[PDB]
């Protein structure tokens, strides 16, 4: 879709080293905008993008109340989950939750999300209908019963269709100069001999936003997907992202190879070759 908002909650037990830590972060697309950490000297919701700073005292107080209350709720939930799996009080465990809304280019709700994991494994998820649950196992069935009694799915549907979208659209307007500006990649191809008969061609994309990008190598106009090494897209630290794709080619055959780049910020997709 065109735009999304997500909150990501992590709660981590640590027997013998205090009560479980709770962290929350909020993103619009690939831009983080708020954080909360229960381990902080003074735990409070803090801004992480300039466009959120304009929100009033009440916004920040409300966020901080919510996250302080979640810190306590999540400690109880970790105790409960330990019991659901007959686990000892000695091990460290993690609950993760992600939720939010996706908008299409017209700004309408494409779909809503609410997903949880326990120790990195899917545990319970709200189905795409925003009405029913998918529980991974007999432990998650207990959570499901609780959430049905508490009308959690109804509460989420109302948020995801309503406040989530409203606030997302507000943030997109307030941060429009960054959130709605796609920065195209700066691109180039480098060449590195590996032997007398082969060299690495590496196609670079730098300084792009958002992170979504396609980098492919073709030989004779044909995608070389199995032979291409593609590093994970990585943050530059200034909001932008970096990526490269590499192929090892026979020396003298370099011109049979083309790197193809697609990104939202480009007028048109690029076709690049090594230029000695």
């Amino acid at each position: 879709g065109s735009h999304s908002m997500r909150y990501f909650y992590t709660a981590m037990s640590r027997p013998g080293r205090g009560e479980p830590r709770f962290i929350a972060v909020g993103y619009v697309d690939d831009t983080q905008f708020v954080r909360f950490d229960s381990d902080a000297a003074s735990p409070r919701t803090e801004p992480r993008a300039p466009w959120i700073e304009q929100e009033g005292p009440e916004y920040w107080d409300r966020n901080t109340q919510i996250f302080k209350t979640n810190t306590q709720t999540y400690r109880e939930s970790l105790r409960n989950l330990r019991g659901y799996y007959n686990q000892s009080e000695a091990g460290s465990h993690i609950i993760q939750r992600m939720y939010g809304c996706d908008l299409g280019p017209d700004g309408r709700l494409l779909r809503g999300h609410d997903q949880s994991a326990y120790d990195g494994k899917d545990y319970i998820a709200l189905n795409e209908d925003l009405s029913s649950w998918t529980a991974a196992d007999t432990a998650a069935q207990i959570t499901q019963r609780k959430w049905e009694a508490a009308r959690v799915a109804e509460q989420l549907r109302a948020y995801l269709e309503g406040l989530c979208v409203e606030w997302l659209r507000r943030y997109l307007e307030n941060g429009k100069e960054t959130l709605q500006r796609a920065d195209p990649p700066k691109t180039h191809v480098t060449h590195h001999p590996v032997s007398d008969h082969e060299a690495t061609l590496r196609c670079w994309a730098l300084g792009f936003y958002p992170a979504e990008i396609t980098l492919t190598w073709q030989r004779d106009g044909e995608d070389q997907t199995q032979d291409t090494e593609l590093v994970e897209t990585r943050p530059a630290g200034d909001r932008t992202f970096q990526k490269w794709a590499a192929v090892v080619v026979p020396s003298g055959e370099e011109q049979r190879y083309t790197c193809h780049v697609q990104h939202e910020g480009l007028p048109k997709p690029l076709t690049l070759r090594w230029e000695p």
């Binding site: 916004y59 409300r62 209350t69 939930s77 009694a149 606030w167």
Partner: peptide
């Protein structure tokens, strides 16, 4: 803005 605190697990 986050949703209000929901029921525990």
């Amino acid at each position: 803005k986050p949703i209000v605190v929901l029921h525990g697990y």
